[PDB]
A paper describes a structure:
The CTX-M β-lactamases are class A enzymes that have a broad substrate specificity that includes penicillins and cephalosporins, including the oxyimino-cephalosporin cefotaxime. Acylation is facilitated by the transfer of a proton from Ser130, via a proton shuttle from Lys73, to the leaving group nitrogen of the amide. In addition, Lys234 is located near the proton shuttle residue, Ser130, and may act to lower the pKa of the serine hydroxyl to facilitate proton transfer to the nitrogen leaving group of the β-lactam during the acylation reaction. Structural results suggest that the slow acylation by the K234R enzyme is due to a conformational change in Ser130, and this change also leads to decreased inhibition potency of clavulanic acid.
Residue numbers in the entry: 27 to 57, 59 to 238, 240 to 252, 254 to 289
The structure:
């Protein structure tokens, strides 16, 4: 297709490896580029962890309001919200928002602990039919992003299908689905990624990821004005362990997709 050829050209100009999956909910069409190759998820895995806790809240009705102590020993490498609440508490809802809207790694680790470890996050993926997602480590070691390492990986196709089922489908209860959408629409970290390549009037909820090997990710649910919603996953990784972030590549892929 023309879109796949422009994405292929983008990838060549970038010096890295690009993976894209688009789902059009208008006619259920899919556009894929390296859609079945594995990429390190990095912080895009936070969506599965928050959704698994939302799923627990369907039976534990008050769960999102439960306070969780934040201790100095809990802090890891990137804790923009958790550091504000040391020697205090945050609710599970506040921790979910911190992970999803600020990429907070201490918050992610609290969600994983609430699910019984990384295997509890992968478990929720399996329960909703995602056979590809695997979470193996906590943050930040899940961001090592080493080529050929299957740990903490998924494919663009699997992630797009899962994001659709969580935000637009019915993998979650209706209040939980709305909560997850609200959280994603308020993300603060994606202004230079998928959002920077789409029309300014569209509404977007997104979750970014970043890691070693210059890994730069974004997964988004997109509401175009006057069109059925879209789900778009853009994953990007580079040959050098120390490569810099390339959010511009995700914006360019989103622009390529949107024009097609």
């Amino acid at each position: 297709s023309a879109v796949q050829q422009k994405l292929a050209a983008l990838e060549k100009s970038s010096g890295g490896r690009l993976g894209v999956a688009l789902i059009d909910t208008a006619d259920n069409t899919q556009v894929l580029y390296r859609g079945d190759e594995r990429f390190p998820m990095c912080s895009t895995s936070k969506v599965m962890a928050a959704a698994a806790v939302l799923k627990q809240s369907e039976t534990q009705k008050q769960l999102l309001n439960q306070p969780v102590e934040i201790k100095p020993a809990d802090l890891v490498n990137y804790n923009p919200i958790a550091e504000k609440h040391v020697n205090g508490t945050m609710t599970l809802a506040e921790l979910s928002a911190a992970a999803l809207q600020y990429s907070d790694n201490t918050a992610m680790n609290k969600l994983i602990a609430q699910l019984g470890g990384p295997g509890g996050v992968t478990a929720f993926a399996r329960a909703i039919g995602d056979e590809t997602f695997r979470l193996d480590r906590t943050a930040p070691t899940l961001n090592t992003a080493i080529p050929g390492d299957p740990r903490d990986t998924t494919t663009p196709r699997a992630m797009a299908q899962t994001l659709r089922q969580l935000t637009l489908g019915h993998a979650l209860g209706e209040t939980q689905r709305a909560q997850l959408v609200t959280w994603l629409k308020g993300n603060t970290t994606g202004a230079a990624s998928i959002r920077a390549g789409l029309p300014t009037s569209w509404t977007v909820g997104d979750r970014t990821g970043s890691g070693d090997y210059g890994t730069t990710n974004d997964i988004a649910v997109i509401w175009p004005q006057g069109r059925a919603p879209l789900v778009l996953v853009t994953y990007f990784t580079q040959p050098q362990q120390n490569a810099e972030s390339r959010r511009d590549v995700l914006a360019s892929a989103a622009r390529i997709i949107a024009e097609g």
